[PDB]
C-alpha cells in the first residue's frame, strides 16, 4: 500500500525562535500541549481526524451497469465506535475505528501497542487523534519507568526569605514570579 493522501500533506514550516529575537504578530494564548504530528491533520475525509481510520480514506469511483452507464459512487470504510482497554492509561478509550484497524489492534495485542509501534507506516496511519493518544501513552510509560528521583520544598523554603529580601530593598514579589525566575536554576 501507499500513504499518498497522508504524506502529500504539507504544513507551514515554523521558524526556530531564539530567546533574543522579536515576537511574531499573533502569538497564541495557551501553549502547545502535544508534539507536532509530522503529517498535519487531514483536509479531505475530516471524519477520520476524530478516529483511528488506519489511513483508510473515502474512495470515489463509478457505479457501472450492464449498459456500462457510469454513475459516480463513493466507497466508505467500515467504521465502528469501540471502547478498547488501555493498560498504560488504566482506562478504556472509545473511538471510531475501521474494522481493519480493530483487527490490527487485536493482532498486535493491545491498543497502546498499536499506538506505540515505531514504524513510519503506523505513524502515517495514526490520525492526529491517534498521534495524541500515542503521546499520552508514551509519556505515561516514561513516567512509570522514571519518577523524578531514582527541590520543590527547597524552593518553598527559600521563597518567603526571597520575598522578604525584595521587600527590604523595596519591591513586592509573588510566587508565580519566583517560580518563573527559578525554573532553570
Amino acid at each position: 500500500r501507499q500513504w499518498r493522501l497522508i504524506e502529500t500533506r504539507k504544513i507551514a514550516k515554523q521558524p526556530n525562535y531564539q530567546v533574543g529575537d522579536a515576537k511574531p504578530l499573533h502569538m497564541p494564548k495557551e501553549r502547545k500541549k502535544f508534539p507536532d504530528y509530522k503529517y498535519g491533520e487531514s483536509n479531505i475525509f475530516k471524519q477520520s481526524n476524530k478516529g483511528l481510520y488506519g489511513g483508510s480514506f473515502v474512495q470515489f469511483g463509478n457505479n457501472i451497469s450492464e449498459s456500462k452507464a457510469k454513475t459516480r459512487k463513493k466507497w466508505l470504510p467500515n467504521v465502528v465506535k469501540k471502547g478498547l482497554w488501555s493498560e498504560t492509561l488504566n482506562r478504556k478509550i472509545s473511538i471510531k475505528m475501521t474494522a481493519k484497524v480493530l483487527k490490527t489492534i487485536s493482532k498486535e495485542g493491545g491498543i497502546d501497542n498499536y499506538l506505540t509501534k515505531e514504524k513510519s507506516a503506523r505513524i502515517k496511519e495514526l490520525g492526529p487523534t491517534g498521534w495524541k493518544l500515542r503521546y499520552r501513552v508514551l509519556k505515561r510509560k516514561d513516567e512509570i519507568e522514571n519518577p523524578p528521583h531514582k527541590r520543590r520544598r527547597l524552593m518553598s523554603f527559600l521563597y518567603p526569605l526571597e520575598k522578604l529580601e525584595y521587600r527590604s530593598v523595596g519591591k513586592d514579589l509573588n510566587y508565580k514570579k519566583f517560580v518563573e525566575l527559578f525554573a532553570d536554576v
Partner: protein, 49 residues
Amino acid sequence: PEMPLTEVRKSHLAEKKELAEREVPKLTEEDMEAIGARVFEFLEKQKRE
C-alpha cells in the same frame, strides 16, 4: 514538546552509538598506492595488447 523514544527506537540508537564507538574503516595511503600500481599495470598490459 518532543515525543519520547519508544523501546525499539532507543535500542536502535544504542546500537548506532556502539557502532560509532568502534574504530572506523578508513582508506589508507598504502591501499591507494597498491590500487594505483595495479591500475598502472593494467594500463600497460592494455597498451601492449
